[PDB]
Design an enzyme around this catalytic site. Structure first.
Site, PDB file in Angstrom:
ATOM      1  N   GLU A 171       0.807  -1.200   0.000  1.00  0.00           N
ATOM      2  CA  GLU A 171       0.000   0.000   0.000  1.00  0.00           C
ATOM      3  C   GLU A 171       0.852   1.266   0.000  1.00  0.00           C
ATOM      4  O   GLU A 171       2.079   1.237   0.151  1.00  0.00           O
ATOM      5  CB  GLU A 171      -0.978   0.025   1.197  1.00  0.00           C
ATOM      6  N   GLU A 314       4.597  -0.280   1.426  1.00  0.00           N
ATOM      7  CA  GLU A 314       4.665  -0.394  -0.037  1.00  0.00           C
ATOM      8  C   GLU A 314       4.728  -1.831  -0.549  1.00  0.00           C
ATOM      9  O   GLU A 314       4.744  -2.054  -1.755  1.00  0.00           O
ATOM     10  CB  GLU A 314       5.883   0.362  -0.641  1.00  0.00           C
TER      11      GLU A 314
HETATM   12  N1  LIG Z   1       4.956   8.186   4.513  1.00  0.00           N
HETATM   13  C1  LIG Z   1       5.627   7.711   3.343  1.00  0.00           C
HETATM   14  N2  LIG Z   1       6.373   8.625   2.670  1.00  0.00           N
HETATM   15  C2  LIG Z   1       7.038   8.252   1.528  1.00  0.00           C
HETATM   16  N3  LIG Z   1       7.094   7.028   0.966  1.00  0.00           N
HETATM   17  C3  LIG Z   1       6.372   6.133   1.679  1.00  0.00           C
HETATM   18  N4  LIG Z   1       6.201   4.801   1.371  1.00  0.00           N
HETATM   19  C4  LIG Z   1       5.393   4.297   2.329  1.00  0.00           C
HETATM   20  N5  LIG Z   1       5.017   5.179   3.277  1.00  0.00           N
HETATM   21  C5  LIG Z   1       4.206   4.842   4.525  1.00  0.00           C
HETATM   22  O1  LIG Z   1       3.574   5.914   5.270  1.00  0.00           O
HETATM   23  C6  LIG Z   1       2.133   5.756   5.264  1.00  0.00           C
HETATM   24  C7  LIG Z   1       1.613   5.405   6.625  1.00  0.00           C
HETATM   25  O2  LIG Z   1       2.227   6.296   7.559  1.00  0.00           O
HETATM   26  P1  LIG Z   1       1.379   7.353   8.409  1.00  0.00           P
HETATM   27  O3  LIG Z   1       0.121   6.740   8.952  1.00  0.00           O
HETATM   28  O4  LIG Z   1       2.201   7.869   9.541  1.00  0.00           O
HETATM   29  O5  LIG Z   1       1.040   8.473   7.498  1.00  0.00           O
HETATM   30  C8  LIG Z   1       1.860   4.776   4.167  1.00  0.00           C
HETATM   31  O6  LIG Z   1       1.950   5.388   2.881  1.00  0.00           O
HETATM   32  C9  LIG Z   1       3.043   3.858   4.333  1.00  0.00           C
HETATM   33  O7  LIG Z   1       3.101   3.159   3.077  1.00  0.00           O
HETATM   34  C10 LIG Z   1       5.614   6.372   2.824  1.00  0.00           C
HETATM   35  O1  LIG Z   2       4.636  -1.835   8.814  1.00  0.00           O
HETATM   36  C1  LIG Z   2       4.425  -1.135   7.767  1.00  0.00           C
HETATM   37  O2  LIG Z   2       4.182  -1.715   6.663  1.00  0.00           O
HETATM   38  C2  LIG Z   2       4.450   0.402   7.821  1.00  0.00           C
HETATM   39  C3  LIG Z   2       4.686   1.082   9.065  1.00  0.00           C
HETATM   40  C4  LIG Z   2       4.667   2.481   8.974  1.00  0.00           C
HETATM   41  C5  LIG Z   2       4.450   3.239   7.861  1.00  0.00           C
HETATM   42  N1  LIG Z   2       4.211   2.479   6.720  1.00  0.00           N
HETATM   43  C6  LIG Z   2       4.206   1.114   6.661  1.00  0.00           C
END
Ligand SMILES: Nc1ncnc2ncn([C@H]3O[C@H](COP(=O)(O)O)[C@@H](O)[C@H]3O)c12
Ligand SMILES: O=C(O)c1cccnc1
Ligand SMILES: Nc1ncnc2ncn([C@H]3O[C@H](COP(=O)(O)O)[C@@H](O)[C@H]3O)c12
Ligand SMILES: O=C(O)c1cccnc1
Lengths: 346, 346
Positions: A171, A314
């Site tokens: 995701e 991701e």
């Molecule tokens: N934040 C991110 N920035 C850049 N590239 C990312 N790839 C994944 N995430 C990650 O951060 C998100 C969840 O974190 P939170 O709930 O704190 O916002 C999701 O996109 C997770 O894939 C990324």
């Molecule tokens: O465990 C994960 O996949 C994760 C944790 C924080 C932010 N994004 C993804």
């Protein structure tokens, strides 16, 4: 959809029995390869695999979407990062892309609800421009959830027709760790504080607020824990829904799915709630550094293979584990036989 | 040998600093890739690597030898299995062979003391036809140990000249888990019962005897824990010595070594005892299902990446981890940059 669910195959115990016996005869002390042996047997029971542990093409499905709850101050990444990274996925510069390439897997980026203009190159399955803010209401309607489940499951099984035998789930969605924690709390009956983590570097000082928001989402929506679709629609997100759909699709197709981290665990909980038959097709990858990971995992009765303290998401962990899956296959097919050497071991 | 030890390079802090900064700028939330980031930085500090995390050719060194202690009833595999499996190593049918091939690594089989006629195809460094029975005396002389340390270390660094940048360490020797436990007990100060495991399917009922034998080896030899060479020669084995030599050689060469399981942990304890400078070059692979694993690991301050309940040996875990090493490199070199996307993350 009821069709789809009804039609998920049970594992092939016959193939599994045959696999176990073959494994026991290999050039090694019985059971010495531990979890690699168990993995091989698990694979052998998957109908889509043709009675043997094997890996053909590999795909990693990345579900991208925005969340209304971002407005609650629960995420430090700017909202636009979803759209940007989504585009980057198309350029092969992201963590999942790089790790997939190394595993020889193809990345499929799917837009299930990014709050931005469409991105060329990305698979379009957009539900809406971001989901509703769970703190004040449901993320979406039950209808919307069911339809996405359907669409994603179909897309997934269709890849099978093209040679894909192994899936990875991932995701991308700023603030998504919030709905994830809500889901986990609901499914496991754990209190929010126990499951809410720092997500993408949330400042320690901002935690409390995140915990409040989660609690509110729950109180306000009153999701039914015994109804996975209920939970997803109310306190989930489009991305979460999409991951659950990959799971349902792979299972119906009788193929294996590699989980990722925390977000994936939440989707997995829903999937199993919705259809327990899904369970045997899932394969853990790594042990997420997110706080609610241990709880989530315990509930899925799963023990990840990899301990990397990873927390990127991701589908990065998923890709990282593919070689392991391939190793169990190689073991199965390429090792010599005890009998052939005249060796006899207790 | 004193030369060799004196000449092991310290890690390059400058390169490490540069690596860390580069990693921090990659297309992801800082620190999100956890142990993969740490691994990359570790690699960057290894002189033989040229200031950057990189992997060229890969080799797995398998040290084979027989042990006099086999006569003590501590092993259920027939003694001849060492020689047989040793030959099999040359045919590519063993577990390590198969896993190495999958990792694109070459397996080097080395005979340091098999109690059988020489095996064509196997590297000849035989000390003797099996080592002495530690229960009643020392495994070998100090001289013998030092010479093997030297010979193996040289052979190891020489491979570097041929493009090998990453080593894996392994063994093959019926009854070898006994000297391994003895070493562990001595180095860690743990009682034998706490460290003696089932090895290759030893029957639960035979454990006590194994524990007695270990205790005896220790009482009888009185190895000095502050003298790694002392310990190896007295209560070790040729295979154990050989693994320690790979470690010393790689370190002198300024290259990384991937550990395997329990036997490898014992050799690692010795290596670090002998030369603490070796430490930074070692890389854990998996968490062995052998009982004394946790203790050994705690003493090395190491946390393996893989939890597979494996207990085959041969360097099988080592090969299984190579892709991980390669992933940290790919991450480092192929991921995009935050700045390039205009993304700003706390
Ligand atoms: N934040 C991110 N920035 C850049 N590239 C990312 N790839 C994944 N995430 C990650 O951060 C998100 C969840 O974190 P939170 O709930 O704190 O916002 C999701 O996109 C997770 O894939 C990324
Ligand atoms: O465990 C994960 O996949 C994760 C944790 C924080 C932010 N994004 C993804
Ligand atoms: N036993 C084995 N049989 C066949 N192939 C093997 N490969 C490794 N081992 C393993 O068993 C030995 C240690 O176990 P113990 O102390 O109980 O004798 C080592 O050779 C270890 O590599 C094998
Ligand atoms: O941990 C190991 O490497 C191991 C354990 C038992 C037998 N051989 C190897």
């Amino acid at each position: 959809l009821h069709a789809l669910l009804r039609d998920i195959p049970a594992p092939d115990a016959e193939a599994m029995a045959r696999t176990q016996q073959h494994i026991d005869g290999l050039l090694k002390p019985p059971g010495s390869l531990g979890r690699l042996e168990t993995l091989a047997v698990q694979l052998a029971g998957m109908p889509g695999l043709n009675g043997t542990p094997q890996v053909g093409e590999k795909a990693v499905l990345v579900m991208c979407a925005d969340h209304g709850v971002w407005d609650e101050g629960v995420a430090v990444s700017p909202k636009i990062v979803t759209a940007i990274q989504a585009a980057n996925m198309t350029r092969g510069t992201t963590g999942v892309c790089v790790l997939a390439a190394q595993a020889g897997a193809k990345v499929h980026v799917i837009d299930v609800g990014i709050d931005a203009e469409p991105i060329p190159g990305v698979v379009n399955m957009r539900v809406a421009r971001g989901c509703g803010n769970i703190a004040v209401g449901p993320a979406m309607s039950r209808l919307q959830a069911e339809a996405l489940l359907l669409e994603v499951s179909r897309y997934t099984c269709d890849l099978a027709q093209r040679g894909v035998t192994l899936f990875g789930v991932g995701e991308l969605g700023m603030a998504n760790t919030t709905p994830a924690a809500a889901m986990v709390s609901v499914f496991t009956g754990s209190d929010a504080k126990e499951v809410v983590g720092i997500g993408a570097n949330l400042p320690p000082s901002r935690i409390d607020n995140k915990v409040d928001v989660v609690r509110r989402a729950i109180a306000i929506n009153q999701p039914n824990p015994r109804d996975g679709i209920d939970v997803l629609s109310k306190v989930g997100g489009f991305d979460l829904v999409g991951m659950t759909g990959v799971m349902l699709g792979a299972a119906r197709c009788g193929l294996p799915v590699l989980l990722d981290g925390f977000l994936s665990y939440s989707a997995a909980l829903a999937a199993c709630q919705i259809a327990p038959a899904v369970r045997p097709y899932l394969i853990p990858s790594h042990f997420s550094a997110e706080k609610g990971a241990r709880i989530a995992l315990a509930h899925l009765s799963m023990e990840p293979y990899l301990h990397m303290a990873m927390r990127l998401g991701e589908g990065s962990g998923a890709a990282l584990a593919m070689p392991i899956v391939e190793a169990a296959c190689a073991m199965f097919h390429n090792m010599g036989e005890l009998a052939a050497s005249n060796i006899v071991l207790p």
